[PDB]
A paper describes a structure:
Beta-2 microglobulin (β2m) is a 99-residue protein, physiologically acting as the light chain of the major histocompatibility complex (MHC) class I. β2m displays a classic immunoglobulin fold, and is well conserved among vertebrates. β2m tertiary structure consists of a seven-stranded beta-sandwich; according to standard nomenclature, β-strands are named from A to G, and loops are named after the neighbouring β-strands. The characterization of β2m structure and folding dynamics gained considerable resonance when the protein was found to be responsible for Dialysis Related Amyloidosis (DRA). The mutant protein is the etiological agent of a previously unknown systemic amyloidosis, whereby patients carrying the D76N mutation accumulate large mutant β2m amyloid deposits, especially in internal organs.
Conversely, D96 and D98 fall in a negatively charged region, clustering with E74 and E77. Notably, the D98N variant 3D-structure is among ones at the highest resolution for a monomeric β2m mutant. Although D98N is the highest resolution structure (1.24 Å) here presented, the electron density in the area surrounding the mutation is not of excellent quality as elsewhere in the 3D structure. The side chains of the C-terminal residues (R97, N98 and M99) and of the spatially neighbouring E74 and E77 (in the EF-loop) are only partially visible in the electron density. Moreover, the electron density of the EF-loop is weak between residues 75–76, suggesting transmission of conformational flexibility from the C-terminus to the EF-loop region. None of the variants showed a marked Tm variation (relative to wt β2m), however some features are worth noting. Both D96N and D98N mutants melt with a Tm 1.3°C higher than wt β2m. Although such ΔTm is relatively small, the consistency of the two values (for two mutants that concern nearby residues) adds significance and indicates that removal of a negative charge from the C-terminal region slightly stabilises the β2m fold. Even if the D98N structure is well superimposable with that of wt β2m, the D98N mutant displays local increased flexibility in the C-terminus and the neighbouring EF-loop; such flexibility is somewhat unexpectedly mirrored by a slightly increased fold stability (ΔTm + 1.3°C). Differences of roughly 1 or more standard deviations with respect to the wt structure can be observed only in the in the DE-loop of the D53N mutant, and in the EF-loop of D59N and D98N.
Numbering used by the authors: 0 to 99
């Protein structure tokens, strides 16, 4: 058996073909086993509509998830990624740095 804690990155991107749109991304990387729970949060509340959830693996024991959706941030709103995994005794919450 092998288990690996995910690395978690939270960041925003504008698609270059449509630069006015903005996407909030979580990249949850290098984890094993593949069982996982991942949410985007807005002011502590789970975002129910997340448009994209893309899972892949490299080696048979390394999984990668890109979880992202369109959003319109304002400076009053706080966003975060919340991940649960067997390697994490408590849910891990990674705040979005608004300059990233």
């Amino acid at each position: 058996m092998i288990q690996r804690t995910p690395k978690i990155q939270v960041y925003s991107r504008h698609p270059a073909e449509n630069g006015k749109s903005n996407f909030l991304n979580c990249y949850v990387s290098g984890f094993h086993p593949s069982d996982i729970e991942v949410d985007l949060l807005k002011n502590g509340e789970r975002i129910e509509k997340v448009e994209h959830s893309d899972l892949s693996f490299s080696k048979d024991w390394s999984f990668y998830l890109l979880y992202y959706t369109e959003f319109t941030p304002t400076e009053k709103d706080e966003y975060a990624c919340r991940v649960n995994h067997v390697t994490l005794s408590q849910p891990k919450i990674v705040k979005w740095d608004r300059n990233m």
